[PDB]
Amino acid sequence: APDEITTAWPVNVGPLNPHLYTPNQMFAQSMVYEPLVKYQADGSVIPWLAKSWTHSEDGKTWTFTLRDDVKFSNGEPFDAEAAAENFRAVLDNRQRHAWLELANQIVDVKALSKTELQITLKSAYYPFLQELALPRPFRFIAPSQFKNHETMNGIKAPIGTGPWILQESKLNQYDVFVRNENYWGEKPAIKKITFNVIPDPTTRAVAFETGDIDLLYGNEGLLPLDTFARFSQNPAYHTQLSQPIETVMLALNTAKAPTNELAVREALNYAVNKKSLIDNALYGTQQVADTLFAPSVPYANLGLKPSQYDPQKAKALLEKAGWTLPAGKDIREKNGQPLRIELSFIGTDALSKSMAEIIQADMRQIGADVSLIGEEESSIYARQRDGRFGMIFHRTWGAPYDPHAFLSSMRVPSHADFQAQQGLADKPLIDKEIGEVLATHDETQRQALYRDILTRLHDEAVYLPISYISMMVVSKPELGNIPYAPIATEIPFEQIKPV
Numbered sequence: 129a130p131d132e133i134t135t136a137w138p139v140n141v142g143p144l145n146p147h148l149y150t151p152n153q154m155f156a157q158s159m160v161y162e163p164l165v166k167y168q169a170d171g172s173v174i175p176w177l178a179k180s181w182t183h184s185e186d187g188k189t190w191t192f193t194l195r196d197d198v199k200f201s202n203g204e205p206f207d208a209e210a211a212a213e214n215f216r217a218v219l220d221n222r223q224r225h226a227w228l229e230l231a232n233q234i235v236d237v238k239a240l241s242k243t244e245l246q247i248t249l250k251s252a253y254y255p256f257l258q259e260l261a262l263p264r265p266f267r268f269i270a271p272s273q274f275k276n277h278e279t280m281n282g283i284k285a286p287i288g289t290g291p292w293i294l295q296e297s298k299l300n301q302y303d304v305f306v307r308n309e310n311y312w313g314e315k316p317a318i319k320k321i322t323f324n325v326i327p328d329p330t331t332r333a334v335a336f337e338t339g340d341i342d343l344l345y346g347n348e349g350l351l352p353l354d355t356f357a358r359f360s361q362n363p364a365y366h367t368q369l370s371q372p373i374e375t376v377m378l379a380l381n382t383a384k385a386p387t388n389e390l391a392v393r394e395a396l397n398y399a400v401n402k403k404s405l406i407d408n409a410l411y412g413t414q415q416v417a418d419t420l421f422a423p424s425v426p427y428a429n430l431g432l433k434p435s436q437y438d439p440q441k442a443k444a445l446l447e448k449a450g451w452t453l454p455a456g457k458d459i460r461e462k463n464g465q466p467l468r469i470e471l472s473f474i475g476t477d478a479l480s481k482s483m484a485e486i487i488q489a490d491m492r493q494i495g496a497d498v499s500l501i502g503e504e505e506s507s508i509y510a511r512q513r514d515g516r517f518g519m520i521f522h523r524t525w526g527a528p529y530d531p532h533a534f535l536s537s538m539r540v541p542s543h544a545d546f547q548a549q550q551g552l553a554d555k556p557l558i559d560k561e562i563g564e565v566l567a568t569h570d571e572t573q574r575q576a577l578y579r580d581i582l583t584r585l586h587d588e589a590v591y592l593p594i595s596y597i598s599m600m601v602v603s604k605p606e607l608g609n610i611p612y613a614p615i616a617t618e619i620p621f622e623q624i625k626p627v
């Protein structure tokens with residue numbers, strides 16, 4: 129059976145409501161549900177469920193011409209009415225989509241005919257098409273599967289137009305997908321995909337070694353990185369490591385002592401030998417990051433000055449700010465108060481703990497006492513939401529979220545980035561400029577605004593960028609080369625071709 133594969137995920141795929149978040153898993157929502165326009169690696173979108181579109185003067189009114197040959201997996205038609213109903217269902221839950229500015233921008237969605245769909249916006253929102261292309265929430269479930277003409281209170285069957293259909297799910301055991309034999313587009317070569325629920329990274333590696341799974345595909349947490357490196361030399365196996373997809377960093381709390389001091393945040397940014405951190409904890413598998421966004425990120429090639437590892441400079445910065453060493457102690461003090469910073473992380477995540485131990489050791493060497501606070505996932509999520517941290521691990525979102533959607537979300541108070549930035553004197557100016565950059569028509573102004581926002585965030589040392597991380601693959605050689613999807617959160621199962 130070379131047209132059936134078995135893979136793994138730490139949890140079940142969830143209900144596969146196209147319009148909700150946890151516990152829905154994005155890769156799976158993307159397997160079943162499809163967008164009007166599809167994101168491509170080059171930053172553009174191509175026609176998808178919409179074959180063409182135009183906008184008014186006045187980029188506020190958009191009219192999409194939809195395909196007329198698409199059916200949902202249950203045989204019901206996809207048309208402008210079905211699409212319009214989906215937009216209504218999403219926007220009936222508007223507050224849950226605040227992070228995504230398109231959700232605050234849509235004023236009206238109307239089916240003008242079976243094939244003409246009209247969307248009107250508040251303002252001329254530039255990233256409109258890219259946001260329609262996201263895994264969620266703007267993808268389409270058969271409206272017959274709404275509950276009481278909504279999706280925010282749940283759905284019936286997870287019926288999409290996509291190339292995969294969920295066959296069955298068993299909580300804490302597995303999820304099975306089958307090829308859609310009535311897909312409007314190209315038939316996948318793979319007919320069946322089974323996801324075994326395997327929460328532990330070493331258990332996932334063991335399941336591969338035993339032959340129990342055929343494919344593992346994910347970020348730096350996919351499997352232990354020492355094991356991945358051994359696998360890459362094993363001629364019985366296939367492995368891949370993509371080019372970097374996003375940044376991993378610390379976020380520093382500018383509203384909490386002692387990270388409220390610019391000098392402290394600058395010093396911390398000179399204290400870490402990132403190459404050593406990566407060679408120590410990540411087995412050399414990732415790239416050093418010195419800016420929030422890699423220079424390859426749209427609008428982010430700004431020539432920002434890196435803070436290279438320089439513990440002499442880190443110490444001098446702290447000294448100048450009045451943090452000095454008592455005899456004969458290693459931890460600096462100012463006004464008799466110790467230079468102590470809490471780093472909270474998920475206590476069961478071994479990679480986080482490994483990185484945190486390295487960070488603690490590096491910062492001790494410059495006289496900062498980092499306290500490691502390892503907690504359960506729920507408590508960490510609460511800390512980020514509410515600003516109850518000194519430092520936390522954080523990551524960017526990858527294409528096409530970076531930079532515009534990541535920046536957009538910095539304005540949302542109940543999230544880590546706003547919370548980390550809350551202490552900055554220029555936070556209001558930053559949030560103003562983020563609003564402006566999303567709305568601006570003037571392309572030179574757009575570049576200037578991105579420059580200013582990213583330059584302030586960099587110069588104010590809000591983050592401590594660590595690494596640009598890659599997607600990783602481990603596979604049975606019989607599966608062949610495994611492609612990557614343009615959207616960092618999607619897995620392109622329909623492009624796998626064992627041939």
Ligand SMILES: O=C(O)CN(CCN(CC(=O)O)Cc1ccccc1O)Cc1ccccc1O
Nearest residue numbers: 149150154227263264265524525526529543617
């Ligand atoms: O992540 C948040 O801060 C809030 N999420 C909005 C932005 N995410 C997009 C999304 O969830 O679709 C960004 C994102 C990008 C890439 C991978 C994962 C990911 O979540 C919504 C969100 C809400 C509840 C639980 C988990 C969630 O992700």
Ligand SMILES: [Cl-]
Nearest residue numbers: 149150151152
């Ligand atoms: Cl989740």
Ligand SMILES: [Cl-]
Nearest residue numbers: 356357360369
């Ligand atoms: Cl490797």
Ligand SMILES: [Cl-]
Nearest residue numbers: 389448449450
């Ligand atoms: Cl001072």
Ligand SMILES: [Fe+3]
Nearest residue numbers: 149150227525
């Ligand atoms: Fe999210």
